[PDB]
Amino acid sequence: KATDKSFQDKLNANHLGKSPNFVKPKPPKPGQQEAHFSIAHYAGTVPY
Amino acid sequence: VIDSGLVMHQLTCNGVLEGIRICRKGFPNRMVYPDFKQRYTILAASAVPKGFVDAKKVTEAVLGAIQLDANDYRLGNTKVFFRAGVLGRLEEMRDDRL
Amino acid sequence: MADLKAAEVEKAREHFEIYDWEGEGKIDARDLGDLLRSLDCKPTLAMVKKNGGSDKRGEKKLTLEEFLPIFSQIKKEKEVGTLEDFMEGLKVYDKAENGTMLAAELAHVLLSLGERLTDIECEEIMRVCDEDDDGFLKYEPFVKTIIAGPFPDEGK
Numbered sequence: 001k002a003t004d005k006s007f008q009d010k011l012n013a014n015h016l017g018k019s020p021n022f023v024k025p026k027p028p029k030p031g032q033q034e035a036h037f038s039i040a041h042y043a044g045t046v047p048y
Numbered sequence: 049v050i051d052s053g054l055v056m057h058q059l060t061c062n063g064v065l066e067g068i069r070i071c072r073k074g075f076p077n078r079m080v081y082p083d084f085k086q087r088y089t090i091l092a093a094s095a096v097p098k099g100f101v102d103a104k105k106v107t108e109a110v111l112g113a114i115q116l117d118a119n120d121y122r123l124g125n126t127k128v129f130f131r132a133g134v135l136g137r138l139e140e141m142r143d144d145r146l
Numbered sequence: 147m148a149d150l151k152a153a154e155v156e157k158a159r160e161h162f163e164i165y166d167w168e169g170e171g172k173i174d175a176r177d178l179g180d181l182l183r184s185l186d187c188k189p190t191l192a193m194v195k196k197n198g199g200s201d202k203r204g205e206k207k208l209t210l211e212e213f214l215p216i217f218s219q220i221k222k223e224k225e226v227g228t229l230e231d232f233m234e235g236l237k238v239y240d241k242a243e244n245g246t247m248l249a250a251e252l253a254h255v256l257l258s259l260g261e262r263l264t265d266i267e268c269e270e271i272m273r274v275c276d277e278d279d280d281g282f283l284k285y286e287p288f289v290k291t292i293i294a295g296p297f298p299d300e301g302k
Contacts, residue, residue, distance in 0.1 A: 001147045005211060028211050032171055035211060080251065086239040087255045090231075097234055103241050110238070126241075142259040 008035040075122060077130035084128050085110060091145065114138055114145060148221050150214060158217055161185060162210055172207040175200040178216065185217065188226050191261055229289060236285045246282035274302070 008025075016022040016037075023038035023045065037048040059065075085106060089096070091113035096106055104123075111121060120134040150158060161184050165173045173181065178199045182189055191199070197216050200206065208216075239247055249272060256263045256271065275283060275291065291298065 001149050003149060005214075028209065030207050030209070031211075032209055082239045082241060083251050083254050086236065086251075087258055089235050089238045096238075097231075099234060100237050101234065103243075106238050139259075143262075146260045 005035050008037065011037060075129035076132050077135055079128050079130075081107070081124060081126060081128045088113070088142070091142070114141065148218055150218060150221075154217075155214070157185060158214060159210070162213055172209065173213060174203060175206040175208055176203050178208065182217070182220060187220055189220075193220075193223070229293060232289050233285070236289065239285075244282070245285055247285060247288075248281050249277055249283060250281070252283060 012024070017024070021040045023040060025036050025038055026047075028035050039046045039048060088110040089106075092109040095109035095113070107123065112118075116138060117134060120131040122129040161181060162173060163171075165177055165181055175198055178197075179189075179191060179194045182194065197219055198206065198208075198212075236247070237245075239251075253268050253272070256268055257265070276287060277283060
């Protein structure tokens with residue numbers, strides 16, 4: 001039952017979320033589309 | 049303006065003291081047994097089920113599902129009879145309970 | 147665990163898109179009611195509001211990410227009603243072993259207690275169904291036409 005969407009929340013909840021290179025997503029709920037995470041580099045930052 | 053001399057004649061004389069002595073237990077609400085049995089029915093899904101059930105005898109559990117007090121109603125044949133107070137708000141409550 | 151198969155997600159996506167009225171892709175928490183209904187699962191408004199639904203229009207806007215986690219939750223509840231409970235239920239009207247039901251006395255039960263129907267919806271019932279000379283309806287064709295729906299064989 002791990003439909004892609006179900007995986008997003010796991011990857012935020014279990015021991016990332018607060019780590020300095022992991023950034024929080026742009027809210028799905030009351031939104032529209034999709035589910036993701038966000039990570040960082042020196043050259044820029046990444047929507048996942 | 050109310051006057052007590054007048055009121056003392058008048059409340060004796062309108063059949064009032066006597067006219068509480070009976071009409072106290074007398075019923076101010078009066079409607080029909082088929083609707084009221086059928087509008088209530090499954091309130092007692094614990095007590096009344098199973099194929100087919102008597103014309104009269106079903107009504108007690110369907111009234112008394114939400115407890116309902118045995119003083120403040122009366123069985124009748126076609127017409128059903130209630131009191132004031134006890135009926136209406138327990139009758140609103142049947143939206144939240146149905 | 148439950149999720150939604152081929153014809154269950156295609157069904158949910160079709161209907162989801164059908165409800166997009168503004169032209170974005172959102173559905174409403176009020177519209178959820180007739181939407182779940184359109185999916186052919188039969189709730190109370192109580193069952194709807196239990197999984198985030200509203201009286202008014204435009205309070206919370208729901209997405210597909212919210213819609214599918216509604217339907218997967220909704221595929222669990224077992225008591226939807228049968229025919230036979232309603233037989234016993236609607237036998238309680240009787241006084242003389244007829245199985246009949248006068249339209250006047252029948253209007254009052256539709257209006258008074260519950261989620262409820264209107265004066266107008268009653269004028270609709272009394273368009274469609276079999277009265278007679280005294281004016282009885284009959285519980286057996288009645289319940290069966292309800293469960294049959296809009297068009298069994300005839301339909302208007």
